[PDB]
């Protein structure tokens with residue numbers, strides 16, 4: 148409609164504000180320039196990361212890169228705990244979605260398991276910059292260069308996500324649209340092992356229609372809307388595909404570094 | 419020709435369809451359940467109105483209320499802003515009727531002066547409901563309760579119309595019928611200052627003729643509809659008189675509020 152659909156693209160919006168502490172507009176906030184309200188402790192190297200492990204208080208020993216675990220692997224490790232924490236908000240997000248909680252628990256898991264990462268790599272863009280990423284609830288800011296300065300296996304597992312973030316932030320979206328662009332990716336019927344495909348697909352459509360008129364209310368000046376946003380939903384389906392591969396290679400040669408159980412469950416079917 | 423009279427009534431319908439931004443079909447379809455829709459933003463308080471001004475915009479007017487122009491006066495400002503736009507559509511409608519467009523400009527004006535509010539009050543029913551009414555191209559829906567909760571002057575100038583629309587919509591007319599009805603109330607030979615009243619009288623007769631015959635093929639089992647629509651015309655002719663009087667009082671008592679120049683011309687001697 149034009150209101151019931153206006154209240155739908157709104158409800159999901161509150162579900163997106165009450166489940167994600169770091170919103171794009173609250174992140175774009177820090178990454179300003181003439182802002183001293185919040186100055187993020189920049190990393191760029193092993194020294195700043197070490198003290199960051201103190202100045203930004205991270206419960207996991209004042210660092211964590213001995214002759215068993217190293218710098219690189221400790222970042223990857225740090226990377227997965229945030230992810231695991233974001234998978235958590237997404238779950239609480241999707242559950243706040245209307246007909247989502249309608250689905251049987253098994254289907255809710257299938258949707259998350261397969262779309263929780265495409266969604267997260269999409270929000271990544273919200274806290275990104277051409278020169279770095281926001282970490283530690285806005286208090287940190289790990290430079291992009293620093294991350295490319297990581298070991299061989301790792302290091303190249305975060306750069307493509309930047310390549311995407313750059314472009315994806317060129318569409319100039321805002322939290323309102325993101326709330327809908329996320330719920331759309333989670334409510335994806337093309338997910339493997341989905342039980343009530345017709346149902347999911349139906350909720351999807353109303354999502355994409357909600358996102359439809361909404362890109363009309365807020366943004367009235369382009370064409371990014373859908374052919375670009377929808378194409379980016381596909382672009383994300385590959386980023387995840389390439390990401391699941393490095394992950395499988397890491398698990399196959401990085402016998403030293405562990406993988407969070409939850410993340411091991413998510414992977415093991417994708418290809 | 420009794421036959422072929424059901425042909426020029428389609429040309430009057432085409433003028434209606436191509437000129438009025440809101441048709442009773444689009445309205446009935448909007449004031450009906452939200453089963454796949456648009457859903458209007460209910461305006462019932464001062465807050466929903468302020469919200470409205472933002473959500474549904476409205477460009478002009480808007481603003482505050484205590485200074486000179488107030489909340490009630492704000493509504494009356496909005497009413498007269500759409501009344502001046504439906505007058506613009508009515509005038510284009512009348513112009514899309516050869517017969518009408520045949521008369522001399524000066525006559526076309528006198529007709530579009532004594533009849534435009536009567537038409538205007540017949541169309542209001544299409545966009546009205548038992549409880550409230552559509553505004554801003556179906557975008558909004560200002561309730562009847564909100565309207566009658568205004569300052570006593572402005573409060574009772576909108577109520578008689580609701581009273582009228584409820585009964586009118588019981589006749590169950592559609593747009594093809596309203597096109598004819600509206601056209602009949604416009605081309606009325608009994609208007610003050612009419613120059614060529616005979617010609618006008620005649621054009622009306624053909625409209626009333628097609629109209630009675632149109633009610634044939636469209637409302638078969640319908641009761642005494644034609645003559646019923648005739649009494650409505652007279653009803654419409656009196657409500658426009660009491661409205662003109664209410665307007666007369668607000669022009670004497672409500673000097674703080676202003677009236678649209680085109681609207682003062684219409685009432686300059688009505």
Ligand SMILES: CC(C)(Oc1ccc(CCCN(CCc2c(F)cccc2Cl)C(=O)Nc2cccc(Cl)c2Cl)cc1)C(=O)O
Pocket residue numbers: 222225226227228229230233264267268270271272281282283289294304305308390394410
């Ligand atoms: C196995 C794993 C964890 O791989 C990933 C690897 C990297 C990323 C991306 C960037 C990591 N990240 C943001 C996660 C996030 C978030 F918190 C909110 C929204 C979106 C996103 Cl993407 C982050 O905060 N990392 C970090 C912390 C301290 C130091 C350093 Cl040197 C780094 Cl790179 C995502 C998944 C996965 O796919 O689940």
Ligand SMILES: CC(C)(Oc1ccc(CCCN(CCc2c(F)cccc2Cl)C(=O)Nc2cccc(Cl)c2Cl)cc1)C(=O)O
Pocket residue numbers: 440493496497498499500501504535538539541542545552553554560565575576579661665681
């Ligand atoms: C001086 C004046 C203007 O007095 C009137 C007062 C009210 C009306 C009728 C209702 C007004 N209207 C529809 C005009 C219309 C139309 F747009 C299409 C077909 C028919 C009609 Cl009768 C409307 O949209 N009003 C409105 C807008 C915003 C908020 C609120 Cl609280 C309101 Cl009441 C008519 C004349 C007049 O006599 O012309």
